[PDB]
Amino acid sequence: LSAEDKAAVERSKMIEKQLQKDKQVYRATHRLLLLGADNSGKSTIVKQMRIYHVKTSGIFETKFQVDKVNFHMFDVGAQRDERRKWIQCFNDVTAIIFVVDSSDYNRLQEALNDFKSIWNNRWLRTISVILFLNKQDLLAEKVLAGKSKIEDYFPEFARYTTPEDATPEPGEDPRVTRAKYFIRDEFLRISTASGDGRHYCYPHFTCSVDTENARRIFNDCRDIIQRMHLRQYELL
Amino acid sequence: SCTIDHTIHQTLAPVVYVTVLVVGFPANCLSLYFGYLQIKARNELGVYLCNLTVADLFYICSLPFWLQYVLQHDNWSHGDLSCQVCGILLYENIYISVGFLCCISVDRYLAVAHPFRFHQFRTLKAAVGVSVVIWAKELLTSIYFLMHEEVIEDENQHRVCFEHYPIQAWQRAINYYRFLVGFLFPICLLLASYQGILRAVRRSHGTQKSRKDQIQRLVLSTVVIFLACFLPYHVLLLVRSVWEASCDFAKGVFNAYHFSLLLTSFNCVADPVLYCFVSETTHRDL
Amino acid sequence: QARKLVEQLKMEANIDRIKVSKAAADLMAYCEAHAKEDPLLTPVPASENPF
Amino acid sequence: ELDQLRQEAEQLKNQIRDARKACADATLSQITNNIDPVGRIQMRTRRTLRGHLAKIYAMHWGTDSRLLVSASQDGKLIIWDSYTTNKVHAIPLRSSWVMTCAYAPSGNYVACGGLDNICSIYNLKTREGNVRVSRELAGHTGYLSCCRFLDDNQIVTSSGDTTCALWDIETGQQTTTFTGHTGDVMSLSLAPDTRLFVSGACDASAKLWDVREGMCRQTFTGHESDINAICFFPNGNAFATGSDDATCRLFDLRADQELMTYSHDNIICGITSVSFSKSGRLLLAGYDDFNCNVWDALKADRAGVLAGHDNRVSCLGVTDDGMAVATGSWDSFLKIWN
């Protein structure tokens, strides 16, 4: 063994030690992918959630920490309309956070189509989706009014009765309780049409200004990891 | 000086021994292959499954000598040794299996009830360390049981293998410590881990109604089959050790103790089925 | 707006093209000439392979 | 007039198609049926490289045929030494998502890029022992797909938006921009003489460019679905492409035609990489179904199969000497076949 060979082996051992150090850090941080629309409020979340916890750039990274657990969120910007190619780079991610506006009736069908496209993608057949019905304050304001009618855009509304399993907060009119579970019903009906039991969709109701979304993401990710561990450790 | 009769010992033993051998050799070999497949793809259970299967094979390989002992009328022909070896693999090799069962239970509990914490306790190196500790306990117990010369002759010249009827003074303490350590600690650990797993799975959201009733069936089946395999043996062991020594009493419960010992041999058939066959991963590679 | 596309098509339309038999002969001749230098096709002696 | 322009364009397209239809003479299978088959080729694993953390999306051999560079989702470039399987360097990345790599011909630089819209250049040989970032190139809009060095001072890149560019390294400004596609472009291959370069995009078209001038010359449209790989035949007068249609094809430049199609009714998955050999006798291609394949270009009959992976194959490469072939898959393993 020449001196050069010994030096090369020593360098390889040092690099291997550093890589082993980095592996533990890598397998302690969970990656989340954020999707939405321009009319949505994903900017509001990424602004007033990381505070409490270059011109042409594609990926924006947000780091937050809940109960000493690290989370990295990735927002996609400056890209084109096509998504069939860069969506496959996200296969080992923990969850996809879909933020949908619940007040604009004009752009609800497009949101449903986008959710259907993400749900039935070939490369995303094992990734769960956390759904955020954002800006519920405006839905209440518009519902308790006359210059609007949700029955106009969707003709199936005047056949819907509120589900028995509901938890209306005190001080909410019955009207705002009915025109609010219909949207979740549509999204979950799209979810349960296919997918078998490999992946699930978690619904939530969220306002623009609130500090609970980190807790909700933590709970959903914990459930996802629990299900993966049940599959892995030979229980189901 | 107490020829005990052993009509039963010569009637039901051969059928059980031959059935266990035939059913449990290929089953354990296939379980070993599955354990290889798991350990290749960076899974911590693979170490435990492989070690459990190896312990089961070690137990199984000892039956043919016992089978020839049973076939023959009270006689043990091979040598003046290997009775202090096959005796170990028949009487004290059933606890490596329970140790690895408890290891699997704790691994499952830390995987499904605290998924965000204890990442360093579920790696391959920790599994190798605990496996080596369990096998070192096996080796120390095995360097025990050899300071005592244990072969006696019968009134009708025969050779009994690893049993003394009027229980000896030195065996009572072994019986007591065996009962406590091997059947009050492992059972408490199993119950306290599986209750936690069931609570965690019933508090979940993404699992459909059907699968929680399934996991429940598997968990109760595992615990119940373990109990039915082991509990009567230990109960009869205490019954003999505490206040059942006088030779007349001894002649009385020979059936009970040997029936319990014969029943405790089904672990080698139960373990590969419950830990290597009823799993979607095992059905996806066959 | 569309003048660029038609200009590109016009530029690419007038080019010098040859027969397919000529291209096939060229590729076949090149492969035959450099057929004795590819280690993948013909396994090399074990004293020459460094992997 | 819009109608007049559309009619003129349609007529000119018909005219250019007529010349192609007329110049066709004979299938390659008729002239190639007088050459003995390659024989059954059976290649086996010789080395194995471990150490990556997650999937790998790139791989490029150097010019000395002994060093290697790889990329992974964890954000790490590792420089290997294939003979002794040691590790020579370990470069951490600013952006985690990387989907391309390159190795400078001289042996001084390594380039990487991805969803971050930046093509980074690294300096391996410094006065100090560490490796540091030389210059970051910016100016695209979409996502990079491939980068290849011409000399130590120029570089050619691909982008998500329909555009390809040529850069200068000392001065970070662009020097020429290439336009004309209608979809995402995803592969590059510089010519051996470093004067022409061809690329393929997601609109079932492949184009050739002149680097000095800046204008397209020919357009080929054999594919129906989107193209995923491209590489030059060693001559410099042909190039082969693979697509998500499960069919590979081989074009030539002077004839301006489409010669052969490697179609099989058993395979349904798509192609994910294509690379030739030293003699131009074996075509290698990765597939989505956990296996790689070997084809004989002149006769179009499958000859070999290379299956040792547990996930999807993503990269492929052949050394300049001709004495090794490397693959990479999403199981974080490199396999140096031979």
UniProtKB/Swiss-Prot annotation, chain B:
Recorded superkingdom: Eukaryota
UniProt GO cellular component terms: plasma membrane
Associated clinical condition: Amelogenesis imperfecta, hypomaturation type, 2A6: A defect of enamel formation. The disorder involves both primary and secondary dentitions. The teeth have a shiny agar jelly appearance and the enamel is softer than normal. Brown pigment is present in middle layers of enamel.
Effect caused by changing residue 229 to A: Increased proton-induced G-protein coupled receptor signaling
Residue span relative to the full protein: 12 to 297 of 365
Compartments reported by the entry: Cell membrane
Cytoplasmic side: 39-42, 115-122, 204-207
Consequence when changing residue 9 to A: Decreased but not abolished proton-induced G-protein coupled receptor signaling. Abolished response to shear stress
Residues annotated as transmembrane: 2-38, 43-73, 79-114, 123-149, 166-203, 208-243, 250-278
Residues covered by region (Extracellular loop 2 (ECL2)): 150-165
Name of the encoding gene: GPR68
Name of the protein: G-protein coupled receptor 68
Keywords: Amelogenesis imperfecta, Cell membrane, Disease variant, Disulfide bond, G-protein coupled receptor, Glycoprotein, Membrane, Receptor, Transducer, Transmembrane, Transmembrane helix, Tumor suppressor
Organism in which the protein naturally occurs: Homo sapiens (Human)
Similarity remark: Belongs to the G-protein coupled receptor 1 family.
Chief location bin: membrane
Disulfide linkage: 2-247, 83-161
Topology class, membrane: Multi-pass membrane protein
GO terms, biological process: cellular response to pH; G protein-coupled receptor signaling pathway; inflammatory response; insulin secretion; monocyte differentiation; negative regulation of monocyte differentiation; osteoclast development; positive regulation of insulin secretion involved in cellular response to glucose stimulus
Swiss-Prot/TrEMBL site (Proton sensing) positions: 6, 9, 73, 158, 258
From Swiss-Prot, chain C:
The name this protein goes by in its record: Guanine nucleotide-binding protein G(I)/G(S)/G(O) subunit gamma-2
Tissue expression as described in the entry: Expressed in fetal tissues, including testis, adrenal gland, brain, white blood cells and brain.
Protein location: Cell membrane
GO biological process: adenylate cyclase-activating dopamine receptor signaling pathway; cellular response to catecholamine stimulus; cellular response to prostaglandin E stimulus; fibroblast proliferation; G protein-coupled receptor signaling pathway
Residues of the full protein shown: 11 to 61 of 71
Function: Guanine nucleotide-binding proteins (G proteins) are involved as a modulator or transducer in various transmembrane signaling systems. The beta and gamma chains are required for the GTPase activity, for replacement of GDP by GTP, and for G protein-effector interaction.
Record membrane topology: Lipid-anchor
Bridged cysteine pairs (disulfide): none
Keyword Acetylation: yes
Curated annotation (Swiss-Prot), chain D:
Phosphohistidine: modified positions: 264
Function, in words: Guanine nucleotide-binding proteins (G proteins) are involved as a modulator or transducer in various transmembrane signaling systems. The beta and gamma chains are required for the GTPase activity, for replacement of GDP by GTP, and for G protein-effector interaction.
One GO CC term, this protein: photoreceptor disc membrane
Impact noted for substituting residue 90 to T: In MRD42; decreases receptor-driven G protein activation; increases trimer formation with alpha and gamma subunits; no effect on protein abundance; no effect on complex formation with gamma subunit
UniProt subunit comment: G proteins are composed of 3 units, alpha, beta and gamma. The heterodimer formed by GNB1 and GNG2 interacts with ARHGEF5. The heterodimer formed by GNB1 and GNG2 interacts with GRK2. Forms a complex with GNAO1 and GNG3. Interacts with ARHGEF18 and RASD2. Forms complexes with TAS2R14 and G-proteins; these complexes play a role in the perception of bitterness. Component of the TAS2R14-GNAI1 complex, consisting of TAS2R14, GNAI1, GNB1 and GNG2. Component of the TAS2R14-GNAT3 complex, consisting of TAS2R14, GNAT3, GNB1 and GNG2.
Gene from which this protein is expressed: GNB1
CDD domains in UniProt: WD40
GO biological process: adenylate cyclase-activating dopamine receptor signaling pathway; cell population proliferation; cellular response to catecholamine stimulus; cellular response to prostaglandin E stimulus; G protein-coupled acetylcholine receptor signaling pathway; G protein-coupled receptor signaling pathway; phospholipase C-activating G protein-coupled receptor signaling pathway; Ras protein signal transduction
Domain of life: Eukaryota
Family: Belongs to the WD repeat G protein beta family.
PANTHER family, per the entry: GUANINE NUCLEOTIDE-BINDING PROTEIN BETA G PROTEIN BETA
GO molecular function list: GTPase activity; GTPase binding; protein-containing complex binding; signaling receptor complex adaptor activity
